[PDB]
Design goal:
The PDB classes it as viral protein/immune system. The complex is a heterohexamer, with 3 copies of chain A and 3 copies of chain B. By secondary structure, chain A is an all-beta fold. Chain A is 0% helix and 49% strand. Chain A contains no helices and 11 strands. In chain A, the strands form 2 sheets. In chain A, strands 2, 4, 5, 6, 9, 10 and 11 form a 7-stranded mixed sheet that branches. A 4-stranded antiparallel sheet of chain A has the order 1-3-8-7, with no helix packed on it. In chain B, strands 1, 2, 9, 12, 13, 14, 15, 16 and 25 form a 9-stranded mixed sheet that branches. Chain B has a 6-stranded mixed sheet with strand order 4-5-3-8-7-6, with helices on both faces. Chain B has a 4-stranded antiparallel sheet with strand order 10-11-17-26. Classes of the chains: A mainly beta, B alpha+beta. The structure holds 2-acetamido-2-deoxy-beta-D-glucopyranose (3 copies).
């Protein structure tokens, strides 16, 4: 039932911006925390952004803090990651993930229960 | 803003207006102390100050060796509180593992290191005793000829070493696991910066920082390893993944009939008392309300001590006979008197010949309770007395509502009332009542048919027939 | 004077000769520490002694900041232990209120201040750090050019400040509420004069003074406020309003049958065990005897953990079948062996193949128990063993009386014995036995006299009549 | 070596490979501190160092004055844990008794003295403050004209006196009885030599020395007497008379049917959960596993918290219906979801609408549980969630075995299933089913006579006869 | 249930006066009896409580020595003897009681039942 | 049922050796701790040696440690005390005693549950 589907990946020039979208199906956001993760080639997968679905409170890891911002639309049941001032090191596959707020155990790959199939960004 | 409702109908009361703070997960941090490696202490000098240093160093040495050797609650599941912390400590025992951290904290006291398959842990060097002894005391105790150090260094070493002694002290009588986490384990500044650097949302960071004294009580410090002059213990901190959802506290007390014959009375009590919080579309129910601590309108709980209930469980308050949730109750004939102090008042279950009153500070007794279940708000009331037990009431501000209704204990026929159901409920009670009724519907049905039958006709060579209630000879009618 | 009686008949024992001490109320005193208000520390001097003072001064500031952020038990009611302390603390937050106190303790360390509508509280300034820092350290840190204080002042400051740090320490890891109240909160001399200056009778003062260590364990210290250089925490002290009334302790153990076939045995246990004290014409009952503490022949309990019972409850001891009080018991078939150590001896419940013995220090085993419930006095006996469990017996002086009687478990017919009533009583068990017994009394009555009735004549187109015990065709007589 | 087996049929799991360490008895040692008897302090000098000494000397005197004034657990018996220590302490108050001890430790710090009729106790002078003050401080405070001691003596006195102060501190808020026993009461070196000189086997001394931190949690310090410049407290130490026998831990969880209608399901739970250890031909059973402390694969327990059971109790794991032991269980209709975390995995009881999953750290959710009772091993699984409750699992190494089998709750006919037996077992439930089966078979027998016997003929002047099951007018056949 | 104080009247300074408190509605053995006073302009304050059975007593500091409290179980009455009266003792004196079971200290915040009071005036004028 | 019978007592010269035997009946050694005690004339009785039946772990009081050694034969259900280099001060009556390991509470006269009738030794 619960599935996630990222889109918006593509070839970007350096200094450019790109927005990814994450459509939730099989559940509603309100009861959940939504996160964006990325894995660049050969590298370990790392957290990037968590958001509270209800309150809209947000979490940004140190590496993108200031450049990246995450948002959510409960009515459209979709979570967005805006990326500004993109750098080549941001080239990665970007994954959408979620967890029930009841089971929330921190942002981070060891703290996730459901995973999207990903979307590729190349700078 | 705190309000309360008393249900006369069920001798229970709900206090609402509370905001949640539920521990949903665990974060494991790694706390480190850099150590000095001083085997023998070389000095033959009987100078008073140096004599003191070897005794303190021995205290230093002694600490290391010790550390080197190193109602419905019955329905809850069983967790492993420090399972996450112990697991991380287990990883730290692996070869090379300690070396990673030491290198990370080479040029800073704070650093992140990712363990085994992906867990990212925060690391903290909070005290560098290696540096202090090796740059201060090494000139004085690395040589026979010993440099008679000033008295302030003696004082200073004791100050720096004292924390180590206390950390060691705590662990020694706690088998390497302490709670609450003391200020020897983690200073106010130390804890605060750890919280700020955690991989969590902004809502969580704020909650923990404004309530650090509570955070200490819900954390574990786990002594882990002493190896290659590095001492490291894991501090396991609570993650509060649920904040600011509505919470309410359910108070209950025995409801009995008030018939004159004392042994003729029946009682019933809602058993579902405890804390309730909305959580992820369901309701988390903490039957042992004592595992939660309340500060104003914020309630701190641990999901390990909870049930996950349908939100319809709330219906038991408005309609205990609702068809959507089987409200839990116990039954007895034990009509003893007591009181329950609520958030904004007091419930009084007063029975038999017991004297029950409530008094004010200056006025004295202002209400005398009659037998039955009743309630008084904390406005203008200071104490409640039931029998020989005096209760001080909570004086917090808030409005109470008295909800009138016929006491439900009145709805049962006492002759078939099952007075020995302890872990029971509304539907279950109905079930036994149906069975007592089944056996009376039929026993009267059967006794009605057996009392309808005729005795044997007299035994002689003549034949008989029935008329006017007795057997009459057939010969008569011929 | 302590005596004890064992009732063979009910596998229970009563210890008497005790004197009461019941906590009935709470007194709240306000303990204050006068503080120094020191923002920045002005000194560029790197003198070691002055360097130490700023480190010591910092522990003081840090402490301030931390403080600025700041069997039948299931039948009991529910109180709010510190509801009273908290209410006084609430009063302490009003603006005009602190000025009153600060002014009251201007020329003395002891003063009475009346709060709101009539409560008279005793107030105590136990430490004046304001005066000490302002007359000692003020010359050295109010100026750049700093007066290198003698080494003895550093120590004294450490000594005086040390009390503040531990108090802060205690409160920081206990969310502002501690128990027992430590000697950091209140020294022995301070407490003793507090008790003496308390608005209570001479009897209470004498009792409390000779047992201050108990008083401490039953007290609460509640961190309340830091404002306008005054630190104040509320100390909530137990009031023992009932003293030297008779008390007795009831010990119970399972009484089972001893038939040969395993699992064929039935058991019964008095559930009314605990401490009992005469109180105001009634009897105060403390089911969880661990909430009471005994010192020689004085027993300290808390009425918050008691029931108030009619004095006829005592009858269960002489006649467990008395018609005036329904003695409470539970039933089961779990005949495991154990012992209950009493004040002056030991009850032994020995069943099955369990090895049960009693030994002397020098002599070794002197009595071997047979199956059943039995007792031995502490005279000449030092230890008891039941199965793999060793019990040391109490060696207190006192006489025991063995009260002979038929074990009451023998009065029940096992075929209708309800062995799984847990929250039961004598009358309740009888009622259920009568119902199981009634349906057999009547069913046998019905199976008889049922055969005195005539069966149905065969169902055909022919007519029948009765003769000689059998149906005969009517056609025959035609 | 730790292994585990899960039994699907009874919703329970056993973890094995553990080795025993059972406290079977008590040893009482007497610890002494030699005291100085200094009434007044004679000195008029306002020298800073001597001024400090009188304040420190006063803390010593003050300390002296204070010291001068001084699941199935419910089936367990009740002991007096420090009855033995107190008894030894009682003997110590007798005249001359203290004099004996003081003489024994005259030329040594360690000596054995036998009390009354044969008890041999170990004695320990751990601190000689008499000697220190009388050879150090006596020259400075025995005269008006006072010898202004070097600053290093002041420091030294504080260190030596501090132990007395901390020791004094613990007892004042614990009424002369402390637990766990701190390193102030008895240092590690003190304890180790105590262990070596104890009348115990070599195996026990070794066990205690490698686990001194455990010894403290299971020890008591009992304040006893201060008289004739001798301070003495009794320390009561655990004796582990059982070591290295096989142990296993039984985990249980509710087993319910999974019918769609929520009020139609029945549940059953094994109540015999806890720690089990082979012991002296029997099995020691500890129902409250929290009374045991685990160190790696060694388990420390107290026999005071045990039952002594036949070794056949182990059979309940392989065959819960075995005829040789009545396995203990409870029954209910409360099908709530929960989990029990085992040594090497997790039992999941998932019923109703509960969300139940298992996840890995990096992979996320890897298993979704269907309704019923199930289990997962800790290999490749990191967390389990049941409803809103998150459980972290233990990550210890060891193999798990899943023993498949039909859930035994399926073997019961719900129409006669006793869903309200709390303190039950297999045979008892069967036994009760028998009473329930009896009462339906016989009731039907009685109802098996509602119509086969003949009723009264109508009461009129007419005669009747029998035909086709009903009365027919005689006039008809005429 | 009633409490009735008596014995109030005009006293000259240095004079003596006895108050009586008649208990009805309870028996003494089970209770604590207290005497309270409220001076002009002043908040009402405790003065003396006593145990009925044992006779144990409590005297506030202000009157300790001058005032004595006693009880007669037989007459079911409680007496406060006042000696060496001072004008500052001018006040209305109230009788109060509490179940020993509910004892929570002597003091106005510690009372369950109250008398209607009796006026005492220490002064020379007339 | 449970009984103990010591034998092997006799007159020894100083420096001589003697072995005592303790026959157990009514129980097996495995479930028990076996101890040896002594009482010299007029003096209070004092412990001398305990042994674990299962592991064979041993206890020697300070006074005899080194000179005396204890052993057990599970097969013969017998416990032996070998005494070497006997001194006249060792003259005493030697008693065999035991306690269930379940009830073990230390070696020592106050820690025994069963007692043999003794055998006299004179040096
Ligand atoms: C009990 O009987 C009543 C009346 O027949 C019925 O309405 C109710 O559904 C029954 N309860 C159950 C649980 O079947
Ligand atoms: C139980 O039945 C007996 C029958 O002799 C009767 O005397 C007794 O009063 C009954 N008890 C109750 C509680 O009904
Ligand atoms: C229950 O009763 C049946 C009657 O047929 C019998 O076979 C069985 O042994 C009984 N079980 C017990 C435990 O009494």
């Amino acid at each position: 039932q619960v599935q996630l589907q990222e889109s918006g990946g593509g070839l970007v020039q350096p200094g450019g911006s790109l927005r990814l979208s994450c459509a939730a199906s099989g559940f509603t956001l309100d009861y959940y925390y939504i996160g964006w993760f990325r894995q660049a080639p050969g590298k370990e997968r790392e957290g990037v952004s968590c958001i509270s679905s209800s309150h809209g409170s947000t979490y940004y890891a140190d590496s993108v803090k200031g450049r990246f911002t995450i948002s959510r639309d409960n009515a459209k049941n979709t979570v967005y990651l805006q990326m500004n001032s993109l750098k080549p090191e941001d080239t990665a596959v970007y994954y959408c993930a979620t967890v029930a707020v009841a089971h929330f155990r921190g942002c981070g790959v060891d703290g996730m229960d459901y995973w999207g199939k990903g979307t590729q960004v190349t700078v | 803003n705190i309000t309360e409702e008393f249900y006369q109908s069920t001798c229970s009361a709900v206090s609402k207006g509370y905001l949640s703070a539920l521990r949903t997960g665990w974060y494991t941090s790694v706390i480190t102390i850099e150590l000095s490696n001083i085997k023998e202490n070389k000095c033959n000098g009987t100078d008073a100050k140096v004599k003191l240093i070897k005794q303190e160093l021995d205290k230093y040495k002694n600490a290391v060796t010790e550390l080197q050797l190193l109602f419905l609650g019955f329905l809850l599941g069983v967790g492993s509180a420090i399972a996450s912390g112990v697991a991380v400590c287990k990883v730290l025992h692996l070869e090379g593992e300690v070396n990673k951290i030491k290198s990370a904290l080479l040029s800073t006291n704070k650093a992140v290191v990712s363990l085994s398959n992906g867990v990212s842990v925060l690391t903290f060097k909070v005290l560098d005793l290696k540096n202090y002894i090796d740059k201060q005391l090494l000139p004085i105790l690395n040589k026979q000829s010993c440099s008679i150090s000033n008295i302030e260094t003696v004082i200073e070493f004791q100050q720096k070493n004292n924390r180590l002694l206390e950390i060691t002290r705590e662990f020694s009588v706690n088998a390497g696991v302490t709670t609450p986490v003391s200020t020897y384990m983690l200073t106010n500044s130390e804890l605060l910066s750890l919280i700020n650097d955690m991989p969590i949302t902004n809502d969580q960071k704020k909650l923990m920082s404004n309530n650090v004294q509570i955070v200490r009580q819900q954390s574990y410090s786990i002594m882990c390893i002493i190896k290659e002059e590095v001492l490291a213990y894991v501090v396991q901190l609570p993650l509060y993944g649920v904040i600011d959802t509505p919470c309410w506290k359910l108070h209950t007390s025995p409801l009995c009939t008030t018939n004159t014959k004392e042994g003729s009375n029946i009682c019933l009590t809602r058993t579902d008392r405890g804390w309730y919080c909305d959580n992820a579309g369901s309701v988390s129910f903490f039957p042992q309300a004592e595992t939660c601590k309340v500060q104003s309108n914020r309630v701190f709980c641990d999901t390990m001590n909870s049930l996950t209930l349908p939100s319809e469980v709330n219906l038991c308050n408005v309609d205990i006979f609702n068809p959507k949730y089987d409200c839990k109750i116990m039954t007895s004939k034990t009509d003893v008197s007591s009181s329950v102090i609520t958030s904004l008042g007091a419930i009084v279950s007063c029975y038999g010949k017991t004297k029950c009153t409530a008094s004010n500070k200056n006025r004295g007794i202002i209400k005398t309770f009659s037998n039955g279940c009743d309630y008084v708000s904390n406005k203008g009331v200071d104490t409640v007395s039931v029998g020989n037990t005096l209760y001080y009431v909570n004086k917090q501000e808030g409005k109470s509502l008295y909800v009138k209704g016929e006491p439900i204990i009145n709805f049962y026929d006492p002759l078939v009332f099952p007075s020995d159901e302890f872990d029971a409920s509304i539907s279950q009670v109905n079930e036994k009542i149906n069975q007592s009724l089944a056996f009376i519907r039929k026993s009267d049905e059967l006794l009605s048919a057996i009392g309808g039958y005729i005795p044997e006709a007299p035994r002689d060579g003549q034949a008989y027939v029935r008329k006017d209630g007795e057997w009459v000879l057939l010969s008569t009618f011929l």
